[PDB]
Curated annotation (Swiss-Prot), chains B, C:
Its cofactor is Mg(2+). This is Ribulose bisphosphate carboxylase large chain. PANTHER family: RIBULOSE BISPHOSPHATE CARBOXYLASE, RIBULOSE BISPHOSPHATE CARBOXYLASE LARGE CHAIN. Keywords: Acetylation, Calvin cycle, Carbon dioxide fixation, Chloroplast, Disulfide bond, Lyase, Magnesium, Metal-binding, Monooxygenase, Oxidoreductase, Photorespiration, Photosynthesis, Plastid.
Length: 119, 448, 448, 119
């Protein structure tokens, strides 16, 4: 019997219960976006998690948005270009979390979010 | 006017874009021809009467009749037929699933000439569906509110449903949620009862929601059952969930009923609450192939009356034909436009004109080894419920939740890389067992 | 605690006076023995789970399990059995028919090992029934409020149900009521619709009620349908009936649902309104002998949730066994204490400990020649509904109402004198034709 | 086609759509009460019908009660005794309607009401 860690084990939604993604594994997740014609977009934040400062009304939370890195990468054909921008974001904000979003312009909604860098 | 005792069979009638259409599986009594049975279905669900009445001369009753406009035989059945019936838009009270059901299924199932009758499908025209709010939020809004993308959601019904104190119940919830499930769940039977009164349960479940959310950094919820004996009690419970600031409440829509459900869906829209819908008692109506109403009709009705989740059964342990029927009504629940497809039990093309979809909830004895099949069949826009599959883990609720979350994310990761879940699923799970002791322990209890 | 995958068959269990008892007609799958099927019925409607969970050790789950305590075969059926199940009082939310149905029929009808399942009867213990208001008024209070004694009441559903203007609809009501009917009736489908909005109908029907009451000197009513898409709309309609001062409103309790129905029954109690209950959609559930719920269960549930009238079908054109089943649930609806009687489908002795009874409403193609049989079979505490049997009279609604009232009073007079309605009925009607031209005209249109 | 009379045809609930009861027919209705152990009771009123003077709330009506003639005839064994009291009531109030009620002490309710005399 092992006890599930109660401290130091905070999470970032989809894929964050897996081992940290290798570069090759991250490129495969980005290629999954590209094959589906979804637009990758990076965002970053030193605060990693939601909070409730301004309202506790149902389904209101603060901290769901992070800060956009540049713009969604419309017309991206090469997953290595997302990895390149990841390294730029880390260099500018090495103390921030960085994650990769995906946008679906047919469903007209955000459709992907997974952690790409932890400080 | 003269007092005294196939008019409703109109095989050349052209359906109107405003008509509500019905597909009935009809079993005539011996000696009743299929055309007369189809005519009876239309008459006895509209304007049929046993003797002439003078008041008919004060209106134009052809404008109010249901018309059986097509009959087909059923393969493999010598005495079953699909009878298609068209109902004028003006029969129906705007916004009322209650009136839609009353008008179409209120009377006809008792007609003596019909040995058995099953309503299989309804074509809800946009002109009528636009009079309904629909889901309080729906799939895309819910994902945005909860900040959850790219995977099925995960839930757990607390067991035993009755027998725990409210505090012990909430303790179980906290341990499930902190291990990686998105939701825990009140059983459909758990309302307010001796030894666990609802407001006490709401307090302790809210404490568990927030403790696990603060611990994990992920937004958590618990389907707090608001089902009640009266509408006033039902709203009272939603109001306290509102005060507690929690994200999601629950309703047993068939046993509470559509009039109460529509009220609660309105309250949820007005207050930002997600609405989890349990389909308790559906199999009283929807199980037998020869009589009742197919679940897809009950599912369309819930989308109209309003809900953000709905229980949809399971596909594992089911034959290919049953899985095809499930996928058919899953598309009817989630999609904007669903083309007719008889192989999946979709009898009519269904256009929802931007009414949001409902997340289907899979449940029923599932565990970690079902994760590849469930992910492959339902895709991301689903909730997978693991009751015994979490609380039955040998290391407790948080490791059991973690095993389920790891199994699911392993499947999602592999799918996204282009691997085939239908053929590689067991190996994907075995590979994750190598680095996840929680999943390895689950995989020895339950079998591939 | 060890994780991993006939305990519920307790044939020597002694039922408690607080237990809710259920009689299920169960059809096992091939190869499933009847004891295992009965055990499954009890497990799958209580505490059964597919894998062990550690939380069971925090309570005493034997206190929450349903027990199948008796199984018997069904004569004439090689694979049907009556399984009797006892449920502890603590499972049930006080005052909530919704929770009672959820708890007992919410899940078990889908269990794979049961090819078919029908709930035939429930034993409602006094300890549970005393948590329910029951009928807003009930048989004896209703007779006292309306000043009506010594005969069945008479009603008429307005036809065509849709197609008339509200004013033309009300005109038909006035003419029926002035001829001697006690009530006219909104069709179960008539709620609020294009071309006849509910508040307009309420206004004109109220005018008709009061015009006919002033003319005849007898108290009149019209079942004003309050069934609606939301609880708020339903109460809004009852509120306006309240303002108009009329005696009776109506609800489709199965399609509106028990949560809304219980709310409306409470409103009616609080405001002095009688509540007419229509059983629209019941045959979706209650028609097939092998699966669903028998109407007597739906009838007990209505008495608990609340109503002053309930539609009960007809006995004419029915075989002796069907009439015996109807009389069984008529006694369950009206009487204080009903002894077990399997020949009438009464599986349990039922004690209502002074909860008032509900007036059964007979309907279905009946006319003047059915008056002796209906009077003999139902007795005084009934409503007999004559839709086409009034509006179909060759001289119009008031003579048609008069023919029905004369036929009924002729039967009552003869019964009270000691004559046998079962043998002299046709002659009693023929004798009344001699002095009542209205009845004579009805008797030539429709046949003995 | 005959038109149902709209004036001069007011009614008194059960049996009032029948021809006026002969004495023999009235005695048979009283004997029906006695055979069932129901207690006959006469009541009378110059106003024949309900009205709504004090309230129009649902199921409130004035004029449902008339005035009791003496007392319910507990222990009545002979229907002619009810007819005797009918003639006394008519003699005292010849301008009043008179009707016969029945009381059921097992159901604990009034159970019969039919007109016996019109002025």
């Amino acid at each position: 019997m092992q006890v599930w860690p109660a401290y130091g084990n905070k999470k970032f939604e989809t894929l964050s219960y897996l081992p940290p993604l290798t570069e090759e594994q991250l490129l495969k997740q980005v290629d999954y976006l590209l094959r589906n014609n979804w637009v990758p977009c990076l965002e970053f934040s030193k605060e990693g998690f939601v909070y409730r400062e301004n309202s506790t009304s149902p389904c209101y939370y603060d901290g769901r948005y992070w800060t956009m890195w540049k713009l969604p990468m419309f017309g991206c054909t090469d997953a290595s270009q997302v990895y390149k921008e990841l390294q730029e974001a880390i260099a500018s904000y090495p103390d921030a979390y960085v994650r990769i979003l995906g946008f679906d312009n047919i469903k007209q909604t955000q459709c992907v979010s997974f952690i790409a860098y932890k400080p | 006017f003269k007092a005294g005792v196939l008019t409703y069979y109109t095989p050349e009638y052209e359906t109107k874009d405003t008509d509500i259409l019905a597909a009935f599986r009809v079993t005539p009594q011996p000696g009743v021809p299929p055309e007369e049975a189809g005519a009876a279905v239309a008459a006895e669900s509209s304007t049929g009467t046993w003797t002439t009445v003078w008041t008919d001369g004060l209106t134009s009753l052809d404008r109010y009749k249901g018309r059986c406009y097509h009959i087909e035989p059923v393969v493999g059945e010598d005495n079953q037929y699909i009878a298609y019936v068209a109902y004028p838009l003006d029969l129906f009270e705007e916004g009322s699933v209650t009136n839609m059901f009353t008008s179409i299924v209120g009377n006809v199932f008792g007609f003596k000439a019909l040995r058995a009758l099953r309503l299989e499908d309804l074509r809800i025209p946009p002109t009528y569906s636009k009079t309904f709010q629909g889901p309080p939020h729906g799939i895309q809004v819910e994902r945005d509110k909860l900040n959850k993308y790219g995977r099925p959601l995960l839930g757990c019904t607390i067991k035993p449903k009755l027998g725990l104190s409210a505090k012990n119940y909430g303790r179980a919830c906290y341990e499930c949620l902190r291990g990686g499930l998105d939701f825990t769940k009140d059983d459909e039977n758990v309302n307010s009862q001796p030894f666990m009164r609802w407001r006490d349960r709401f307090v302790f479940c809210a404490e568990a929601i927030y403790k696990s959310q603060a611990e994990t950094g992920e937004i958590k919820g618990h389907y707090l059952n608001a089902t009640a004996g009266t509408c006033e009690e039902m709203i009272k419970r939603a109001v306290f969930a509102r005060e507690l600031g929690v994200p999601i409440v629950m309703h047993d829509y068939l046993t509470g009923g559509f009039t109460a459900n529509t009220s609660l869906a309105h309250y949820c829209r007005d207050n930002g609450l997600l609405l989890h819908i349990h389909r308790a008692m559906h199999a009283v109506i929807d199980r037998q192939k020869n009589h009742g109403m197919h679940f897809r009709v009950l599912a369309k009705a819930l989308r109209m009356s309003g809900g953000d989740h709905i229980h949809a059964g399971t596909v594992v342990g089911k034959l290919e034909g049953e899985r095809e029927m499930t996928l058919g009504f899953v598309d009817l629940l989630r999609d904007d436009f669903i083309e007719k497809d008889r192989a999946r039990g979709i009898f009519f093309t269904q256009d929802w004109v931007s009414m949001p979809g409902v997340i289907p909830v899979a449940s029923g004895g599932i565990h970690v080894w079902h994760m590849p099949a469930l992910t492959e069949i339902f895709g991301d826009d689903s909730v997978l419920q693991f009751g015994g599959g979490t609380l039955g883990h040998p290391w407790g609720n948080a490791p059991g939740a973690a095993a389920n979350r790891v199994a699911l994310e392993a499947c999602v990761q592999a799918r996204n890389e282009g691997r085939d879940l239908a053929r590689e699923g067991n190996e994907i799970i075995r590979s994750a067992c190598k680095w996840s002791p929680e999943l390895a322990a689950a995989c020895e209890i339950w079998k591939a």
